[PDB]
């Protein structure tokens, strides 16, 4: 039984990345997945991702540029306070200037660095570096 489609997408992405493949097929399609992909794309850790429309959950084909070390999800989505970002970043990321911890806040899917600017917090859902 599918329980975390976000984990399925990131696991498939990471498997293709470690194998050296330049692209990966992702099923199914979710609003969280697309927003999570766009966070990758803004920092350039991926390239083009294309969504195939269907009369069901869609598919995504992501073109990988090879500059992607590790992407993973967090289960459950712990409720994080503003004072807890630094502990979460330290215990989970490499050196604190490359990776980006992904949260879901009332402002939407967005980074841990962006949270410090906007002074908001929420639930941790993933990470990359």
């Amino acid at each position: 039984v599918r329980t975390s489609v976000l984990h399925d997408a990131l696991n498939s992405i990471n498997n293709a990345e470690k194998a050296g493949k330049r692209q990966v097929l992702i099923r199914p399609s979710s609003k969280v997945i697309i927003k999570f992909l766009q966070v990758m794309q803004k920092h350039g850790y991926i390239g083009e991702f294309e969504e195939v429309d269907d009369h069901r959950s869609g598919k995504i084909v992501v073109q990988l540029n090879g500059r992607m070390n590790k992407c993973g999800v967090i289960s459950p989505r712990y409720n994080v306070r503003l004072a807890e970002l630094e502990k979460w970043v330290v215990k989970l990321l490499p050196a604190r200037q490359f990776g980006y911890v992904i949260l879901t806040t009332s402002a939407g899917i967005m980074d841990h660095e962006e949270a410090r600017r906007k002074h908001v917090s929420g639930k941790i859902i993933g990470f990359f570096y």
Partner: protein, 81 residues
């Protein structure tokens, strides 16, 4: 291979893969017209009919279901729609 354009696979591959495992699950079935001998009526029959189809008024069996594919009665011509 490390480099495949998964968006636009070969049409030969599409005819090769499973009907669900393709990029978009297009059904492999079709609708087809049966011409019965001795009469001039056209009846639409599913390619994978599960019932013994008899023509409308001709009282003649047109196909027998078996193994997930209809076997047309001998002496009838067909044309895929």
């Amino acid at each position: 291979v490390l480099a495949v354009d998964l968006l636009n696979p070969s049409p030969a591959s599409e005819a090769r893969k499973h009907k669900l495992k393709t990029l978009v699950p297009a059904p492999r079935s079709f609708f087809m017209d049966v011409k019965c001998p001795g009469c001039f009526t056209i009846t639409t029959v599913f390619s994978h009919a599960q019932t013994v189809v008899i023509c409308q008024g001709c009282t003649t069996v047109l196909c027998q279901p078996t193994g997930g594919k209809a076997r047309l009665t001998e002496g009838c011509s067909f044309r895929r729609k």
